[PDB]
């Protein structure tokens, strides 16, 4: 005689709920798998890659259950520009009597510590092995900088391929090669379309996929047939994620930083502004233990041009009002997870795609903006993403002086001009600010066929720093 809502509240209470994070715990002892961290933040970032019009977000909603907005009326159907964020909790069940493959269970961010076992007849409770975040990268030919930024923030990969379509999909190859560029060898291949398939056709496509991945960097990548609409083979992907992907080294010794990819103004309309909030920047902490009430500055920040034409950068200092992660407001942030840093920053500053690929540093560190940067570049033999109708995939030409090139350092989408080209190094001038922290893997893309085309990889070697104006 109980409502579903009263029920859910009951088994949420019986599951231990969602405990509040402590104000000040012992950080020298915390691991990304402490029960304190896993319940209220994601420690592993997983990205999704695939061909256009494939349904990457559909697999994400099958796994977690949180939608990816898909906004802007026009972009409600075709393609979205920003990333796709959803939170999944990997619940294993402690009873070994039930079969291992259906033990694993992925649930939304709102799930409890120990909710009951949905399998009929099993009295076990789920234990949360890890909370993970999901980034749905774009899948189109024009949007490339956001994809590469997502790959840079990615820690694990999920490749999606459809079966009955043509076997050599070049968008998938471009995604995998870009993931290879930014030091990611943890990829799980996913066969999206298996229901409308024959027994021999699936085997032939599997053979084709296995033949495809022989000469690339990634060798031992698993392949899983999942159904995005039928909502099955969900536990298999979760157990594969648990097994093959370990934790990249990210501890508390490394200095704190932030890399903002998305911005979120907080200006709830219609109500009086006497009750208002700040402005949220969606950024990832690849290194750093950030807490509530800390000083931070956006390194490239305010971009201005004087009467002489010189580019001036005013780093945007700001006091962190709040940090948003997982579901509840959290006191201290765990590196290895997208976080909304909600600060006293201006409402307009976070309005549009403005804080897309910028570098932010806490008070107590000085990242350097650079105006001219020396890069060490390497490049492939043929472009990926060009469907040649039976003729020798376009072979890439060597770079030329005075060429506009889209250079993605980390997450920043900058247009560099070539000053010098050499055998294995090059010199780039940035009309848009970029900053150099430590190593910061880079990707290079050219204008060859109308739209952007990835060519190779690069690393920052030298540069001409610009001292910020106080």
């Amino acid at each position: 005689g109980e409502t579903e809502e009263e029920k859910r509240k009951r088994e949420f209470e019986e599951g231990g709920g969602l405990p509040e994070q402590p104000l000040n715990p012992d950080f020298s002892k915390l691991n990304p798998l402490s029960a304190e961290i896993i319940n209220r933040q994601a420690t592993i970032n997983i990205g999704t890659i695939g061909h256009v019009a494939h349904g990457k977000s559909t697999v994400v909603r099958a796994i977690s259950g949180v939608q990816t907005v898909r906004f802007k009326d026009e972009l409600e159907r075709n393609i979205t520009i920003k990333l796709g964020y959803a939170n999944a909790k990997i619940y294993k069940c402690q009873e070994p009597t039930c079969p291992e493959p259906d033990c694993y269970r992925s649930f939304k961010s709102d799930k409890e510590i120990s909710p009951k076992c949905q399998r009929p007849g099993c009295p076990g409770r789920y234990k949360l092995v890890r909370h993970v975040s999901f980034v749905d990268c774009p899948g189109h030919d024009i949007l490339m900088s956001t994809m590469l930024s997502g790959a840079a923030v990615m820690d694990a990969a999920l490749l999606l391929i459809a079966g009955n379509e043509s076997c050599p999909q070049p968008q998938t190859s471009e995604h995998l090669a870009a993931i290879e560029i930014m030091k990611l060898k943890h990829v799980i291949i996913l066969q999206n379309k298996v229901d409308l398939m024959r027994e021999e056709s699936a085997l032939e496509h599997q053979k084709s996929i296995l033949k495809f991945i022989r000469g690339t960097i990634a060798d031992g990548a698993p392949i899983v047939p999942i159904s995005a609409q039928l909502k099955y083979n969900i536990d298999a992907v979760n157990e594969f994620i648990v097994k093959t992907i370990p934790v990249p080294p990210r501890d508390f010794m490394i200095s704190p930083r932030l890399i903002v990819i998305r911005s979120f103004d907080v200006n709830k309309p219609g109500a009086e502004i006497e009750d208002l909030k700040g402005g949220v920047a969606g950024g990832s902490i690849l290194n750093g233990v950030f807490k509530l009430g800390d000083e931070i500055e956006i390194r490239p920040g305010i971009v201005t041009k004087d009467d002489k034409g010189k580019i001036q950068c005013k780093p945007i200092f700001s006091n962190i009002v709040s940090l948003f992660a997982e579901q509840n407001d959290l006191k201290f942030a765990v590196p290895g997870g997208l976080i909304g840093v909600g600060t006293k920053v201006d409402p307009t500053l976070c309005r549009a795609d403005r804080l897309v690929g910028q570098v932010v540093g806490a008070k107590g560190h000085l990242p350097n903006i650079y105006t001219d940067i020396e890069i060490n570049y390497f490049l492939l033999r043929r472009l990926l993403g060009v469907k040649t109708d039976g003729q020798k995939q376009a072979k890439v030409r060597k770079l030329e002086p005075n060429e506009v090139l889209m250079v993605n350092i980390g997450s920043t989408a900058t247009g560099a001009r070539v000053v010098a080209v050499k055998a294995d190094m090059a010199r780039l001038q940035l009309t848009s600010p970029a900053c150099t922290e430590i190593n910061e893997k880079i990707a290079l893309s050219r204008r060859i066929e109308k739209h952007w085309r990835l060519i190779g990889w690069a690393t920052i070697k030298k540069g001409t720093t610009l001292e910020p104006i106080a």
Binding site: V345, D346, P347
Partner: protein, 267 residues
């Protein structure tokens, strides 16, 4: 009952412009009634009617509806009008419909009053409408000023004070016009703290609201802040919003950010 011609006297003057509703055609044209001046009948000869070719007589006469009218000759000894539909132009038609509405509204209000009181409506125009049209040039504008100013009814002698009360109530109910002035300002700040600056500026903006004019700084976006006020006279709202603009600029010129205006105060 409709009587007691809206204007002063019974017979139209020379070259006065009026509005006539078609009532009956024998052969010569529209010997019909007026709806702006007195309802006295007046000739409309067919050649005094058509600018285009006379193709559709019945589509053109349109019995039962008002139309433009220019008076050429008046019978001031037995009562007749020489009236035409040829000495008109479009810009003349504009003031024609203006006067049509102006007379219609006053006839409606005073017909309501005379119907409710059963007091002869000619006495209503005698006691009320004609003194207002003498003071202010037209009883419609006088009613509009009565809505704001009570003094218009002083020096005027009621046939009964309940007439004054009912007229006040009905003109307040039907002739209720206050215009909204809205402005749009872009916050373009790239600075460190603007949200608190926005708190200060918007508190200052809303404190300036007067008891009769509450300016409400509403949110519709992050850069675009909207500013709405109910101008009671439509002359102080512009300066109120200019004060708000000075406030916003003065607040943001110091914190380090930048703010700019898109839509100044407009009714």
């Amino acid at each position: 009952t409709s009587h007691c011609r809206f204007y002063e006297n019974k017979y139209p003057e020379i070259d006065d412009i009026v509005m006539v509703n078609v009532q009956q055609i024998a052969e010569m044209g529209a010997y019909v009634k007026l709806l702006e001046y007195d309802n006295i009948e007046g000739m409309i000869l067919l050649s005094e009617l058509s600018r285009r070719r006379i193709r559709s007589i019945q589509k053109l006469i349109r019995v039962g509806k008002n139309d433009v009218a220019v008076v050429l000759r008046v019978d001031k000894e037995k009562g007749y009008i020489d009236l035409s539909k040829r000495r008109v132009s479009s810009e003349d038609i504009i003031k024609c419909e203006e006067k049509y509405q102006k007379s219609k509204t006053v006839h409606s209000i005073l017909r309501y009053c005379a119907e409710k009181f059963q007091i002869p409506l000619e006495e209503l125009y005698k006691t009320i409408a004609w003194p207002l049209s003498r003071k202010f040039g037209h009883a419609y504008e006088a009613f509009k000023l009565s809505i704001i100013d009570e003094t218009v009814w002083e020096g005027i002698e009621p046939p009964s004070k309940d007439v004054l009360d009912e007229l006040k109530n009905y003109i307040s109910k039907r002739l209720t016009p206050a215009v909204k002035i809205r402005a749009d300002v872009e916050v373009s700040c790239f600075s460190y703290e603007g949200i608190d600056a926005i708190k200060d500026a918007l508190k200052s903006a809303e404190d300036m609201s007067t008891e009769q004019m509450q300016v409400k700084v509403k949110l519709v976006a992050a850069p675009l802040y909207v500013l709405t006020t109910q101008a009671l006279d439509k002359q102080k709202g512009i300066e109120q919003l200019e004060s708000a603009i000075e406030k916003i600029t003065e607040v943001i010129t110091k914190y380090g950010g930048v703010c700019n205006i898109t839509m100044p105060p407009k009714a």
